[PDB]
Each structure stands twice: as structure tokens, then as C-alpha cells.
Symmetry: D2
Subunit: 287 residues, 4 copies
Amino acid sequence: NEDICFIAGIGDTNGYGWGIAKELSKRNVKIIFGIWPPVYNIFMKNYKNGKFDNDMIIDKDKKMNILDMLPFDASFDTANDIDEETKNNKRYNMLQNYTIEDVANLIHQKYGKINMLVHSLANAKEVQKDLLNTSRKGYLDALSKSSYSLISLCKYFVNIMKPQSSIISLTYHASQKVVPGYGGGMSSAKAALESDTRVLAYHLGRNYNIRINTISAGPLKSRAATAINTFIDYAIEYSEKYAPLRQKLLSTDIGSVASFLLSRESRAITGQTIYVDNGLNIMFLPD
Amino acid sequence: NEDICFIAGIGDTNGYGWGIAKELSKRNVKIIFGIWPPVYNIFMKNYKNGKFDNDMIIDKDKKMNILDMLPFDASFDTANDIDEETKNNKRYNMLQNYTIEDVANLIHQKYGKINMLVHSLANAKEVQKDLLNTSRKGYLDALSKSSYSLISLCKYFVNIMKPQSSIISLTYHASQKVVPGYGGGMSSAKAALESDTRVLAYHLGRNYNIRINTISAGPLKSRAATAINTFIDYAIEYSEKYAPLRQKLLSTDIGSVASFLLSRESRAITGQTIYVDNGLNIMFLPD
Amino acid sequence: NEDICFIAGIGDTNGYGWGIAKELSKRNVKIIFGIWPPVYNIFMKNYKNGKFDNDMIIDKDKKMNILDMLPFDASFDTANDIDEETKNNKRYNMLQNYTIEDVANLIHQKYGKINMLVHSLANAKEVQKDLLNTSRKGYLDALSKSSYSLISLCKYFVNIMKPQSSIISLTYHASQKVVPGYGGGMSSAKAALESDTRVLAYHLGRNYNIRINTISAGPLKSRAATAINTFIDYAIEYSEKYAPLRQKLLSTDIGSVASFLLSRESRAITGQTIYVDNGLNIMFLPD
Amino acid sequence: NEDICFIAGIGDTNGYGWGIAKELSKRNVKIIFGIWPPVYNIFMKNYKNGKFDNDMIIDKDKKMNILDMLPFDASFDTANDIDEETKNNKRYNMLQNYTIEDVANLIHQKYGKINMLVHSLANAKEVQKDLLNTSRKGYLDALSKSSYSLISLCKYFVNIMKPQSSIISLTYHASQKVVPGYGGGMSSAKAALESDTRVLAYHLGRNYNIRINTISAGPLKSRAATAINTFIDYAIEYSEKYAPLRQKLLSTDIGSVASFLLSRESRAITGQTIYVDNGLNIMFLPD
Ligand SMILES: NC(=O)C1=CN([C@@H]2O[C@H](COP(=O)(O)OP(=O)(O)OC[C@H]3O[C@@H](n4cnc5c(N)ncnc54)[C@H](O)[C@@H]3O)[C@@H](O)[C@H]2O)C=CC1
Ligand SMILES: NC(=O)C1=CN([C@@H]2O[C@H](COP(=O)(O)OP(=O)(O)OC[C@H]3O[C@@H](n4cnc5c(N)ncnc54)[C@H](O)[C@@H]3O)[C@@H](O)[C@H]2O)C=CC1
Ligand SMILES: NC(=O)C1=CN([C@@H]2O[C@H](COP(=O)(O)OP(=O)(O)OC[C@H]3O[C@@H](n4cnc5c(N)ncnc54)[C@H](O)[C@@H]3O)[C@@H](O)[C@H]2O)C=CC1
Ligand SMILES: NC(=O)C1=CN([C@@H]2O[C@H](COP(=O)(O)OP(=O)(O)OC[C@H]3O[C@@H](n4cnc5c(N)ncnc54)[C@H](O)[C@@H]3O)[C@@H](O)[C@H]2O)C=CC1
């Protein structure tokens, strides 16, 4: 009854962002998508052309309720951070108000205050290279777009959020244990994300009584992943063979857990890393 | 519909088992109480004399749904394990079928297969003494009743559970970090419980497609809690003052998380230790 | 000079207790062996018949320094705990002072106070069965001999130890992650051991200025290891193939880490679980 | 007998770098200091003026053996990374060869190959601000100088290192648990460092058979620390009051552990975070 969620990081219907949106729809939550400018127009085209129609069906006679879809780039905090190469870039020149702060004001101006925030984005320019061979520039780019973006989102959005609101982000187990092909500083970015989730829980909890948690999801071949060296193919094969639960991991499985963590049911949970991976993380030696 | 849960470890309405029952009732789950014999009669008397009527109110008038109340002692696996003294004891004399094997059979014969199991019990003869001064017998007593009981419950109940059923137990952070005052081997018992949860998730997951998780709750002033002499009032005060979320921790806060974990919405989560403690566990240095 | 260490849990030269003895000898530490009665005679016979001469060679000719070899059974805290059957058993009949309390007194009376204690023992009657099929008695048997023994050792030995003394035990990763094959409650016992190590570090640290840590070793083919039926050859093969350091893990590798932990050079380390497993524990997905 | 260690991050004699150097000297290890250019000249002056003479005394007639002292800035990987503001800067204009790669070649050119590397440096421009208020620039600066610098050091130094060499860095527990005044992204940087230590252990272990670990040290009021909001004063007071071991934590206590991790004694340890904090990290509730 008046629940609005902003999902930062959606480019298709095969990722976690979509799965999360589908489950949140069952609870009658109004959804607002944050779309990376470079793929915003194409996404909008597919949408208008009905290419996503079947993916929006939920339960019996119920369709996903998308309030709005806005261009959004997590690498720019404010208008001042926009450089020339970007302001002059073709894909961006046509858009406006895509920095984190501009989006929060835009959302607040059109729909009022929200109470659910989802950080579901990762980006590492050198994800194909192993950590040892990742450049300083690539490493920082990974931390900047995948980790700091979480902090910035919170800084600017708590202003347009209601007390007792909830925030979640997605992480991967490579931050705690070694996963050979998860390079480019992505493992580093996930390690910082998980630690920052704890520190943020303290600050947001004491100052605004807002909760924040992160979901350590299992493999799901998709947009990003598929750019990981391939790599995602093995992760899935291994997961489906050695995980305590031999069922297929769906985006809606992360979605339903996200839904719970964003509702008042989770009232007493904050600063945690919740594993939704069919229990794969508990194994040591594969049978 | 057709959701049946057996809660093992209820002696009154001031514990987690009760808060868990109320919350499950909100989702229309049929409840079956497993009550420790020493307090079975008192509990029932109070129930009949309507001393729990107020505590059974859920949602506008909706009253808790209790299907049955059975005498249950987690120390005995089968009738063969019951010693002469206990069998002749004044509070056990007129009771029957209270061992773990007998209760599984009784529930099966009377209601068919169930799909939700809650282990909400702990016991330690020497809890007032610190670990170093705990005797072998007291240590093993704590482990037997607090940890092994989970394993035994699983062994006998898996035969009367449907596939995709869910099982949860309750633990405390003293298993991972030092909490002076939590003696008698209770900390040892919790560590074993948390480890056994992972191992059982593997066995129960692969062989029966059944899940098992454990909830690490924050301090609650219950009978078991006060048994430690108070330690509990300190734990509660400290928690309400240093946790990132400064609010009173209610038994129903754990209850709602338990309902989520017992429902099919947590389908991809197993073998985990979920913290429901207002975030206290993430803190290192207070303020 | 004046460094005396009691090693509890030696039955031959193929285990960690031996590798630990050799390494301590390199630093001129006087060694006292605590041998399980069932194998006391065989061990001694072999020692006298010079069947260990080769294995006692440390550094150019320097030979191991064994101060004494005592019958020791970790199941008994005091002489009062010894049951009629064990007392009359063929291998215990002619032996005396083998309980934990009696050995502490004997060592004290004969050599004075010591300053180094090594708990290198484990036992589980039902180790061949998986956790789910382990009986209450077998579970408690595992916990009693493998975990409680550490606590008891501490209680009686703190009276005969100097301030700043050091204590170590050995654990295995199966306590934190699922290892199919490590049954009988051994995984449960290790989890309790690791948790008890932290709690005891608090008590022993504040009250006696004594330290206690535990080493989580990698796979070694010893008697206890082969008791599991082989599981061990698999663990070893897997380890030498997937660990970040591909080298054979030697008992003396654990020995040198044990010497460091037992010496005053580790003065500021206590209550910890130190992994000496060629790094295997940090891996998630193999290759 | 031919052991050389490079210590990156030394500005005075009151930090961990010095404590580590002192202990390494007892083992006859030749020491090479890496000094941040901005304070290189002042440091050199004090040295020449004998201001550090007393701090170099070790044991009886033994003085610390400093092979060399070179200007070193962990924020520049190669000569090409040097910008104008720096090349034109007064403090730098007078120096040359202070980038990571230049130092490795310089060291290799003068003294040959080394076998011990210590990363002991941290720097966060906004360490006084809480994480929520840290800018993107400050966050990345913290990760760049405190975390990436580890990766870069390894990349360029493995070339001048011998097989079986060892590397260590220093970290703090704020990466795992919340520490209110440890801001500026320093907690984030430590979280990434610890995770990267694992990934690097895998790559360095398999490719060059080189080990890498990190030491999670306890409070020690010093150069950096004292710039933390003060903050270090409380940390120490708390540590000395609630830690299991009530002794003062000295820089040489970290030193002796570092010494062990850098020697062949640690042969089987890699990718680990070793706590040297008098056990403070194991506590939950303070007595
Ligand atoms: N790929 C996988 O299987 C796993 C996914 N999750 C996490 O879930 C998140 C999304 O993963 P997927 O759904 O697989 O990926 P997608 O399905 O690739 O989602 C990532 C989104 O990030 C957006 N993005 C990239 N750079 C951006 C920028 N600068 N500003 C704004 N948006 C930007 C993309 O346009 C895209 O919609 C990531 O944080 C990932 O680490 C966690 C573990 C494994
Ligand atoms: N209250 C607290 O502070 C915390 C509670 N939880 C855990 O929740 C569970 C229950 O705790 P509370 O609700 O506080 O306690 P209660 O509220 O004391 O619940 C424990 C129940 O166990 C029953 N019981 C004891 N021995 C038994 C046996 N041999 N057979 C059958 N039933 C037996 C008692 O009769 C009682 O109803 C325990 O596992 C406890 O460790 C976890 C962390 C903290
Ligand atoms: N071998 C391995 O793969 C691993 C060994 N370690 C641990 O190292 C310790 C010893 O292991 P190993 O050297 O492999 O075994 P051994 O080499 O089998 O050492 C165990 C010793 O315990 C003694 N023992 C058993 N029950 C006893 C009792 N009641 N009283 C006195 N002594 C008793 C045996 O006689 C034997 O000498 C155990 O705690 C084990 O769990 C830890 C992880 C893996
Ligand atoms: N301060 C403390 O009590 C703690 C210290 N340790 C860790 O030990 C390390 C050093 O700490 P302390 O000895 O207290 O500090 P110092 O004693 O302040 O050592 C830090 C060194 O970093 C150097 N440095 C800064 N920026 C540099 C750059 N761009 N290039 C090259 N060198 C640079 C400084 O000149 C200084 O010598 C840090 O990584 C810190 O996090 C770990 C936990 C707590």
C-alpha cells in the first residue's frame, strides 16, 4: 500500500534485477528501473515492441507494474562529475539527469518518497585478466562502479526514503574464497561491498533506522557473467552437481529472498550477507 | 493449505517457540506442540484455565491455531532408552509415547506427513559454571540434549516429511565469540549445532530434498535465559544500546524470519546460520 | 633451557604428535609422551627394540630428546572415573596413574612445573558412519574423548604450569565446511574444540596469563586417518592437486608451526585457529 | 645466510615497519627500507644525526643491519604514471626512481634477488570522515594506496625474488567488524586487502611457489593511527582492558610473528589472515 522500489542496474530480463522485480510485483510493489544510458534506448525499444511482454506476466491475471524507467549511471555522483568525453558522447548527449543525485531528485519530484532500494550492478573493465595482471586503472574502475556506487546511492537516497526503509545489494562468494576466473578486481570489489554493508548498517541503522543487507547469489548465466571467462558455464555445472540441493537456481529464487529482506518481516536483520546458492557455499570437498 | 509444523521445545509463552507459533499461525500453519514432561501438566492446566488466551491473539481476533500438544523429551531416542528412574518418576508415570521415535510415529499415524520442523530447545545442568569448571557429565549432558537432539529429530522425522520440507533450530553467537556467563558447555553445544546444521544440509538435501537452517537470535528474557541466574538483563541492555538497530527484540521478530525460512520462498537457502539480532554481531567496539 | 612439553596422543611415528616432538627437540625442549594404554606396550617394545631409531634423527645426528613415556587415557579425569571393566582389562591391569589428574600430579612430582602442552588426540567409535546415522552414545563418545579432554587437560594442568605457558590442540576444517566421510561426530567434536579454544583463551588468559590456540592441519596418512576406512588417500590426492602450494604436507610442517606457537615468540596470539594446510582452505572451486 | 627484506612503508621508529625490521635483524636478515618521498629527506637527516641510534640496538652487541634506504611511493607503478604536479613538486624533483618498478630494478641492480617482502603502508585522505560521507575520490585514493599497492608490489617484485620467498602485509579487524572511527574507506581497503591476499596466494603459489599472508594487528599508537579520530587512544584503552591477555602490545610482537611468517618455518601457511592482537578479536560481550 504505497511501496516503491528503485532497482539500479537492469539491462535485460535475464538478470537478478528482473527476478527481483518479478517477485516484488507479487507483493504489489511499484517498480522503478535504473538503466545504464549506453543501453537505455535499446531497452526502451524492446519494451515498446513488446519483446518483454511474456517476461512481465505474473501469477494469474497480474502483470508487472513498472512505474517508470530512467537512464542511470552509477559512476557519476552529481552533474559536476560529468566530464566532456561523456557530455559529448552520442549515447549520453540525448539524455539528461542520469547522475545518482539527479535521479533521486527526479524520483522524489515525480513519485515522492520511496522505501525500497536495490543495488544490482557490477562492472569491471579488466574482468578477463587475473588479479595479478589487473592494472591500477582497471582495479579502481571496478571498485568505483561496483562498490563505491553503493555508498553514493545511500548518501543521496536516504533523503527521499521513509524511516524503516530497506536496502539490499548482490554479492558473490569469490570475495571470501578463491575463484580462479573471477578477475579484474571484481573479487576485491565484492569484498569491499560486503564489508561496507556492515559499516553502512551501523550508520544507517543508528541515524535513520534503515536496514541494509547483501545477497550472496549463486551462478546465473546472464549479461555480465557471460563476459566472465565461459566462466559462468563451469560455475553452473559445478553448482548443479555438488550443491546440497540439486535444483536449478532461478532469478526468482533470489527475488523472493530479496522481497523478504525488503519487507518489514526482516525488521531485525541488518548488515548481513545472506547466501542464496542452494547451499553450495558450505561444501569443502566435492563427493 | 496442509502446512503442518511440529515445534519441539515449548514450556510457556515467554520463549521463541511461542513467537514462532504465533507467526506461523498468521500463515495458517497447523501447529503441534512438543512439551517437556516436567512442565507438561502445568502448561496444560494454564491452557485450560485460559491463562494463555490473551497471548494467543493474532491479528484482529484471529486466534492461534493449535492442532495438538504432546509430551516430548529430547533426551530419549526410543522407548528402550528410557531409564527405570525416569519411567517411574511422578511426572512421567502417567505419560506415554514421549520419546523422539514415539512422537514421530504418533504424529504420522494421527495427521499424516508434515512439512515443517522447529527445534527450539536447550538444556544444560551446569550452565551456571564457566566452561573450565564444567564436569565431563555436565558437558556431555549439554551436548546430548542441546545438539544431538537435533540430529535424532532429523533421523526419525525425515520418514514422515514431504520432499522440500524445512527444518530450523535456534543458536546463539557465543558459539563464535566469547560471552562470559554462557557456561556449562552451552557455547560448545551451539558450535556443534551450527556445524551439524551444515553437514545435515548436505545429507538431507541430496537424499530427501529437505532443507535445514539455524537462526542465531539475540537476547530474550525467557525461562532458559534466566536459568543462568542477571546475565540476561545485561545482554538485553547491552543489545538495546549498541546494536545498529536500537529497538526491543521481540520473540515474533524471530518468528517471522522462521516462517520465511520454513516456507517455499527460501527454497534456495540451506545449511546457513541466519542472524536475527538487530545487527549486534557485526559490531566490534561499542560506543 | 628448562622448556618441558607434555604431548598427549602418541601411538607411533606416523602422526602429528611425532612431527611435533621432532621439531620441539630441535629447540632443545624436553619431551614427555602421554601414550594411550591399548598401545602402550607395543609402542614401548618397538622403542626398546630400536624400531624408532631412524625416525628419531634430527639434524646431523642430533637425536630426539625423550624425557619420559607415560600411560595416559583422556577418557578418565580422576581415578574415581575408571570403571570396573577398564581397571581389570588385560592392557590396563598392570598400569597405574593414567588418568588426567594422576598424570598431572606425576609430572609435577617428578619434574616440577612444565610450560608447554600439546593435545594431539581424537577418537570416535562410529567414525565410519555419517552424522545422520551416528547414535547418541557414539556422538557423545566422540565429544567426550576428542573435545572435553582438552578442557579437562587444562583444568588439571594449569596448576602445574608457569605463567606465560602455551597450549595447542589440532583440528580439521570439516568443522567449518562439509567433508563427506568425516563422520561419527568427529566434525561436531572439532567445531566444539575450536569454540572451546576461544572460551578457554579468555579464562586461561585473564586468570593465569596462559595461551591456547589450535592448529587446523591438512590431511596426513596416520592411524586415526585410516580408521575412516580410502577417504584419506582421496583427501591427500585432492590436497596435493588443488592447494595453492603443491607440495607434500609433512608432519614436521605442522611441527614447526606448533613450536612457534608454543614459544614466547607468539606471545600476542591466543584463542586462534591457525591453518597449516598449504592454503587449501581458501579455495572454493577447483580447477 | 643471504636473506634480504624490503620493507615498503617506514617513516619513523614507532610503527610496525620498524618493529618488523628489529625482529628480522635478530635472524641476520639484511634490511632495505622503502621511504615515502615527502618524508625521505627528514628521515635521512634524523638517521645521520643519530636520532635513531638507540632504536637500532638489538640484543647484546648487535645493531640493526640496514643495507639501504630508498625513496618509494606506492601510488606510482612506473615512470609513465608520474604526473606533472609530482614531477614538478619540490619534494620529488630532487629524487628519482621512486615508482614501484624503478625500485625493484634498482634493488635488483645493486643487491641482486631478494626473498622477503613486507607491505606495511596505509593512506586514506578522508580517514577522518565516516564511510557514508567519504567522497568517491577519497575512497579510491584509499583503495589505490592501501590495497592495489599490494598487487602492484607483487607484480613487479616476483621478478627479483627467489622461489619459496614470502610476502606479508598488515591489516586491521575493522574489515570484518564495525569500528565507528575507522573511516575514509580504510575499512573497505582492508577488506579488499584480505580478500586479495587469498587470490594472490593462489596465483603466486601455483606460478612461483611463493607465499603471502597478512597480519591483522591490534592497536599501536603511531604516525598514521594518531591521524585517526584520538581514535587510537580509545582502541588501546579498550584492548588493554578487555583482551584475554592483559599485556601491552609491542611493535616487536608483530615483528616476531612477521619474522616467522617470512621464514621457511611457515612453509605450509599461505593466504591467511593471522591475528596478533592479544586475542581481542575473539571477544563479543565485554565483562
Ligand atoms: N553474474 C552472476 O551470476 C552473479 C550475479 N550477482 C551480482 O548481481 C549483479 C548483477 O548481475 P547480473 O544480473 O548477472 O548482471 P546484468 O544482469 O549484467 O546486471 C548488471 C547491470 O549493471 C548495469 N551496469 C553496468 N555498469 C553500470 C554503470 N556504470 N551504471 C549503472 N548501471 C551499470 C548493466 O547495464 C546491467 O543492467 C552484480 O553486482 C553481480 O555481481 C552475484 C553473484 C553472481
Ligand atoms: N533466550 C535467549 O536469549 C536465546 C535463545 N535461543 C535458543 O532458543 C531455544 C529456546 O530458547 P528460549 O525460547 O529462550 O527458551 P524456553 O523459552 O526456555 O525454551 C526452551 C524449551 O526447552 C524445553 N526443554 C529443555 N530440555 C528439554 C528436553 N530434554 N526435552 C524437551 N524439551 C526440553 C523447555 O521445557 C523449554 O520449553 C534454545 O535452543 C536457545 O538456546 C538462542 C539464542 C538466545
Ligand atoms: N591425520 C589427519 O588427517 C588430521 C589430523 N589432525 C588431528 O591430529 C590429532 C592426532 O591425529 P593423527 O596424528 O592423525 O593421529 P594418530 O597419529 O592417530 O594420533 C592420535 C592419537 O590419539 C591417541 N588416542 C585415541 N584415543 C585416546 C584416549 N582416549 N586417550 C589417550 N590417547 C588416545 C591414539 O592412540 C593416537 O596415538 C587428532 O586430534 C586429529 O583430529 C587434524 C586434522 C587432520
Ligand atoms: N595504526 C595501527 O595501530 C594499525 C596498523 N596496522 C597497519 O600497519 C600499516 C602501517 O601502520 P603504522 O605502523 O601504524 O603507520 P606508520 O607507522 O604510519 O606506517 C605507514 C607508512 O605508510 C607510508 N606511506 C603512506 N603513503 C604512502 C605512499 N603513497 N607510498 C609509500 N609509502 C606511503 C608512510 O610514510 C608510513 O611510513 C598500515 O597498513 C596499517 O593499517 C594494522 C592495524 C592497526
